[PDB]
Amino acid sequence: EKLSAIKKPDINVADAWEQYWNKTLVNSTPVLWDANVERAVVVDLPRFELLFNPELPLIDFACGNGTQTKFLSQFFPRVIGLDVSKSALEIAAKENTAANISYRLLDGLVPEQAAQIHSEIGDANIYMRTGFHHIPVEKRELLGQSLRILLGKQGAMYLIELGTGCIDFFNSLLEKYGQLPYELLLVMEHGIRPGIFTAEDIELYFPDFEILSQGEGLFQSIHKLPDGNYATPPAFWAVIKHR
Ligand SMILES: Nc1ncnc2c1ncn2[C@@H]1O[C@H](CSCC[C@H](N)C(=O)O)[C@@H](O)[C@H]1O
Ligand SMILES: [Cl-]
Ligand SMILES: [Co+2]
């Protein structure tokens, strides 16, 4: 049935995502957001590469299976891929390893883990591709805390999320074709739902941050529509740094 903007299934976020990734690992099923780098991080990198100090470590926050992480590691001297899911990192460590990548478990909803990481590496820059929009609204402040801790004063963060129009976009597919995309259903099977992240959310969760640059555009999925084009929901992106 139809996706809701407000109402959502109540989940344990860590558990739901590990269930999804373990199912993905075991069964080798498609991953909705796992677009080839040329349509993903290659599009992102020009938006932040001239703004990040490359002497800081780079964190791929919520790195999933590491597809984007591998590319980042070809451009930055030191990359750390963080994810809540051990199965995600098991795929990453097999398919997307490099001498200058470390994959490490971390739960963004437990800010003490971010504190531990920052105590080891200092201020880090952050790349985050769709790490926020699916987080239940009532848990978002915890993730903001984690991010604030990792960035400190000198770090900058580029994030790209599903933006305003996300739910309408998916519901129009449902209306036009009678079901949601297979690859989206694969995630929703676990109680996970896509959501919306906006400029107003940057102010809400990061009032102590400056927006260096922002925009909208499209987010690239691997779901092919009947005309042969890929489904591309609306995106919101920003580069932010502590004021
Ligand atoms: N609480 C949390 N802490 C850290 N990562 C989390 C998290 N909740 C979900 N995630 C991770 O967020 C990712 C969203 S899917 C996007 C993955 C990756 N950035 C890419 O673009 O390919 C998943 O890998 C999921 O396991
Ligand atoms: Cl939770
Ligand atoms: Co502050």
DSSP symbols for 156-224: EEEEEEE-TTHHHHHHHHHHHHSS--HHHHHHHTTT-------HHHHHHH-TTEEEEEEE--B---SPB
Token duo for residue 49: 């590469």
The domain that holds 220 is classified in CATH as 3.40.50.150
Annotated binding site: 21, 83, 107-108, 129
User: Å resolution of this model?
Assistant: 2.1
Longest distance between any two alpha carbons in the chain, whole Å: 51
- Kindly report the three-state secondary structure assignment for every residue of 170-188: HHHHHHHHCCCCHHHHHHH
Residues 6+ apart with CB under 8 A from 16: 190, 191, 192
Residues 6+ apart with CB under 8 A from 175: none
CA pair distance 218, 109, nearest whole angstrom: 27
Torsion of CA 148, 238, 156, 35, to 10 degrees: 100
Query: If DSSP codes are grouped into helix, strand and coil, which group holds residue 141?
Result: helix
Residues 6+ apart with CB under 8 A from 27: none
Residue 114 is which amino acid? A
Method of determination?
A: X-ray
Contact 40, 68 (CB under 8 A): yes
Which residue is closest in CA terms to ligand 1's atom 12? 62
Contact 80, 124 (CB under 8 A): yes
CA pair distance 195, 130, nearest whole angstrom: 10
CA pair distance 118, 112, nearest whole angstrom: 10
CA of 87 to the centre of ligand 1 (A): 11
Contact 104, 90 (CB under 8 A): no
CA of 46 to the centre of ligand 1 (A): 22
User: Rounded to whole angstroms, what are the CA distances from 161 to 41, 102, 138, 197, 201?
Assistant: 13, 24, 17, 6, 11
Number of separate domains in the chain: 1
Annotated binding site for S-adenosyl-L-homocysteine: 21, 83, 107-108, 129
Domain encompassing residue 163 = 1-243
Token duo for residue 86: 């051990």
Q: Which of 121, 161, 158, 152 is nearest to 243 (CA)?
A: 152
Give the pocket of ligand 1 (CB within 6 Å): 13-14, 17, 21, 33-34, 62-64, 67-68, 83-85, 88, 106-109, 129-131
CA pair distance 99, 240, nearest whole angstrom: 29
Token duo for residue 117: 């990481």
Query: If DSSP codes are grouped into helix, strand and coil, which group holds residue 38?
Result: helix
Q: Which of 128, 76, 84, 134 is nearest to 109 (CA)?
A: 84
Token duo for residue 125: 């820059």
